[PDB]
């Protein structure tokens, strides 16, 4: 069952972003949580109102209700009092993980912080894998950053897709055969790892979309980032086995990252 929010409980304050789908606003929502009379929330308003989109909306709302985890962006409910159709989410003040990485990179984040970021993304992916859920578009741009470096996995909907697919995050079987699995999500996490330790640099930045496709399908691996300890690079490479059956489990990848997250390796980006 999907929770319904009364329109006059939502008070729109500021547009946070926009795409083809519609708009995202910062808002104050009343009668949502008991201790909080007024609390901040992220409101997604959808452009289309037609039944083809309206049924697709409820479908999304249902799935969003069923996904409940610490590192998955919280869905609070819906407002189906005509057009526009509203979707309420928790407020993540720092926005997407890609922009946060670039803006807190060459104060810049430390080894322990980047590992805290990585482990949090792995935790959410473990949750997803457990439900047999395939994200298909895992990347830092789809992760959100809240108060006190709390990282959650979400999903938005520009030059990051070829004709459309985020090829640079995709393994060969997904590029060639269009097959997205739990194993293809592990490959993506490996690329998310590269992105974290490069402070949000685009995978294969020295290459074009078409050139990168040939580079991935031939089995070329992204080089070890300067800020990346070799223990973390081993984790990435394990996510990048040509054979999906030979790629590590996300449960395992998280376990290894969590070990480093609590016991940070004595590493310095300068010496190598
Ligand atoms: C400049 N700037 C500063 N802050 C912002 C900002 C912009 N947008 C935000 O909210 C958006 C972000 C995208 N989004 C999802 O991620 C839904 C969603 C999909 C899938 C899923 O499940 C899955 F895939 F993870 F399993 C979970 C969840 C809808 C909505 F929340 C927020 C903000 N949240 O405050 C903050 C922009």
């Amino acid at each position: 069952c999907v929770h319904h929010i009364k329109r006059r409980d939502i008070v729109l304050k500021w547009e946070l972003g926009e795409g083809a789908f519609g708009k995202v606003f910062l808002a104050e929502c009343h009668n949502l949580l008991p201790e909080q009379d007024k609390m901040l929330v992220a409101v997604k308003a959808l452009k289309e109102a037609s039944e083809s989109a309206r049924q697709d909306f409820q479908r999304e709302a249902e799935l969003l209700t069923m996904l409940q985890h610490q590192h998955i962006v919280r869905f609070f409910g819906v407002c189906t009092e005509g057009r526009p159709l509203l979707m309420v989410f928790e407020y993540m003040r720092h926005g997407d993980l890609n922009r946060f990485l670039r803006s807190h990179g060459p104060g810049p984040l430390g080894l322990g912080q980047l590992l805290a970021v990585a482990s949090q993304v792995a935790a959410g992916m473990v949750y997803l894998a457990g439900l047999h859920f395939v994200h298909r578009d895992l990347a830092t741009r789809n992760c959100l950053v809240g108060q006190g470096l709390v990282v959650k996995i979400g999903d938005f909907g520009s030059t990051d897709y070829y004709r459309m697919l985020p090829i640079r995050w995709m393994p060969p079987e997904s590029i060639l055969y269009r097959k997205f699995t739990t194993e293809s999500d592990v490959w993506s996490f490996g690329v998310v790892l590269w992105e974290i330790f490069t402070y949000g640099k685009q995978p294969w930045y020295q290459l074009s979309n078409t050139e990168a496709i040939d580079c991935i399908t031939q089995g070329r691996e992204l080089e070890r980032p300067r800020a990346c300890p070799p223990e973390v690079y081993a984790i990435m490479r394990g996510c990048w086995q040509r054979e999906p059956q030979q790629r590590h489990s996300i449960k395992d990848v998280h376990a290894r990252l969590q070990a480093l997250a609590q016991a940070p390796p004595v590493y310095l980006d300068v010496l190598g």
Side-chain angles (χ1 to χ4, degrees), residues 1-162 164-272:
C1 194
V2 173
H3 183 242
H4 287 249
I5 299 146
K6 293 170 199 281
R7 188 55 193 76
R8 292 193 77 194
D9 274 325
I10 313 145
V11 173
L12 309 164
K13 317 300 260 183
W14 199 263
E15 194 168 323
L16 293 165
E18 70 163 311
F21 64 95
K23 292 174 178 284
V24 191
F25 309 90
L26 172 56
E28 296 195 307
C29 189
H30 302 268
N31 302 300
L32 191 57
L33 295 198
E35 204 190 39
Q36 289 189 279
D37 191 275
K38 67 173 182 180
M39 77 173 293
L40 306 178
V41 285
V43 174
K44 181 188 168 192
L46 279 92
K47 199 182 87 74
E48 256 272 71
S50 70
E51 295 308 301
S52 57
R54 176 65 188 89
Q55 285 291 304
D56 208 303
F57 174 86
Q58 184 73 204
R59 200 172 179 185
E60 212 166 308
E62 275 167 25
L63 176 61
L64 266 283
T65 306
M66 282 162 75
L67 304 159
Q68 289 190 67
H69 185 78
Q70 294 67 33
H71 302 287
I72 298 296
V73 47
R74 247 175 137 178
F75 172 78
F76 281 127
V78 296
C79 190
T80 43
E81 285 172 49
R83 201 222 285 270
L85 297 162
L86 308 188
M87 264 189 182
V88 181
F89 299 91
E90 74 188 313
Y91 180 51
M92 306 289 276
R93 60 205 214 107
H94 304 116
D96 67 66
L97 183 61
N98 190 249
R99 204 225 163 172
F100 183 86
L101 284 168
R102 292 181 182 270
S103 70
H104 292 62
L109 307 160
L111 182 39
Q113 300 193 96
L114 299 168
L115 286 171
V117 167
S119 201
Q120 284 182 90
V121 179
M125 286 313 283
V126 173
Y127 173 70
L128 288 193
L131 294 158
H132 309 282
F133 189 96
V134 179
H135 192 282
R136 298 183 153 197
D137 189 29
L138 186 77
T140 65
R141 73 177 172 278
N142 278 332
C143 305
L144 288 158
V145 186
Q147 227 153 47
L149 202 98
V150 51
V151 183
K152 301 182 198 201
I153 308 172
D155 186 18
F156 294 88
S158 160
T159 187
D160 279 352
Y161 312 72
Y162 203 59
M164 45 171 35
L165 309 105
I167 65 100
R168 304 181 183 266
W169 287 266
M170 270 153 67
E173 73 271 12
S174 309
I175 289 152
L176 304 162
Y177 323 118
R178 256 86 164 271
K179 197 196 174 183
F180 298 105
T181 58
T182 295
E183 292 61 52
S184 79
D185 269 15
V186 125
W187 178 283
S188 290
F189 181 80
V191 189
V192 175
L193 260 195
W194 189 88
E195 287 191 286
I196 292 153
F197 287 86
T198 55
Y199 297 92
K201 243 171 201 76
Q202 183 130 129
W204 310 113
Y205 55 88
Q206 286 219 301
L207 268 41
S208 71
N209 285 311
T210 345
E211 285 168 331
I213 288 155
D214 189 83
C215 202
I216 303 163
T217 55
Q218 97 123 55
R220 282 209 61 208
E221 279 182 1
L222 287 150
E223 73 285 359
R224 183 202 63 102
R226 179 156 57 255
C228 179
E231 296 91 335
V232 185
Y233 194 55
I235 299 186
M236 297 182 193
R237 296 184 70 178
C239 299
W240 310 324
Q241 283 297 320
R242 207 180 302 234
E243 172 64 57
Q245 286 166 343
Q246 287 219 58
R247 278 165 217 166
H248 279 106
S249 72
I250 194 77
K251 217 178 265 162
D252 203 352
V253 164
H254 175 53
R256 300 194 208 238
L257 281 159
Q258 204 169 17
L260 303 170
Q262 60 87 24
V266 193
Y267 177 80
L268 223 77
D269 56 295
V270 163
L271 301 172

